[PDB]
From Swiss-Prot, chains A, B:
Keywords assigned by UniProt, alphabetized: Acetylation, Cytoplasm, Lectin
Additional free-text comment from the UniProt record: Forms hexagonal bipyramidal crystals, known as Charcot-Leyden crystals, in tissues and secretions from sites of eosinophil-associated inflammation and some myeloid leukemias.
SMART domains from the UniProt entry: Gal-bind_lectin, GLECT
Protein name: Galectin-10
Known partners and oligomeric status: Interacts with CEL.
InterPro entries reported for this sequence: ConA-like_dom_sf, Galectin-like, Galectin_CRD
Stated role: Regulates immune responses through the recognition of cell-surface glycans. Essential for the anergy and suppressive function of CD25-positive regulatory T-cells (Treg).
Localisation: Cytoplasm, Cytosol; Cytoplasmic granule
Known tissue expression: Expressed abundantly in the bone marrow. Expressed exclusively by eosinophils and basophils. Not detected in monocytes and neutrophils. Expressed in CD25-positive regulatory T-cells (Treg) (at protein level). Found in intestinal tissue from patients with Celiac disease, expression is directly related to the histological grade of mucosal damage and to the number of eosinophils found in the duodenal lesion (at protein level). Found in sputum of patients with eosinophilic inflammatory diseases such as asthma (at protein level).
UniProt xrefs under SUPFAM superfamilies: Concanavalin A-like lectins/glucanases (SSF49899)
Pfam families in the cross-refs: Gal-bind_lectin
Amino acid sequence: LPVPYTEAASLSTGSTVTIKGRPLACFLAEPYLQVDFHTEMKEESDIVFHFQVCFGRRVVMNSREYGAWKQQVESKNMPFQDGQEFELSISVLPDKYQVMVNGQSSYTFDHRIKPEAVKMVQVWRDISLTKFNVSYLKR
Amino acid sequence: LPVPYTEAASLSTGSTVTIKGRPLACFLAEPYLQVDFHTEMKEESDIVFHFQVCFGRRVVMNSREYGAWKQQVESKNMPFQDGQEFELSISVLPDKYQVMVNGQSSYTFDHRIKPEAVKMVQVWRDISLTKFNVSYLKR
């Protein structure tokens, strides 16, 4: 899959975004992974959910609203494993996103903007990607 | 050119490393560029010169010696232009590296390890690359 990876998308309660991929360097090099849920197809559009991994160090989550970054949430939780493929599953719950890493609940982020505002998902920085899916099974 | 880009290399006084490329996102997204001069072909080897651009924000330079990062040099100088191709030229002078951006002297970094210790150059993070060259014209 090409990285940066972009897909038009819609989200609501019950939606799951599944990403399978792979850092491009060992953790000692501090590769990054970024997943952004955008309100428009344009990359300068607002970001309802920003998820940024500095592999082996930290994760930051935030939103970008009317062009400006808001209060970041910083986590030191690091379930990702050096040199390994990862499977990332972001579920849209009524009150928050829930982020699973290799099947383990690892982060959550309460909705600041309704998920129905999302029109695009971008996955980029220092990863390769073998799978991307947005589920569309629920009303 | 594939990114991450790796080339075996040797450097001495008079050597020039010329990199031509292009951020993968606008500056608002804060794409990065990293150029590392390594002592071995392995990515965990020491880094004689680390050059890391956070486009539109800062540049940091450092060395990684026996596995540990040393004193970083942080610069707010930012000659790179939003959305534009750049031409980066790193010259090996007797006392320092000199970094030109689009023909303009922009950064320098005094040698901490002799440049003759370099065996590999890696260029990676959020850029595309159209040209890479190491000059080999001087004794």
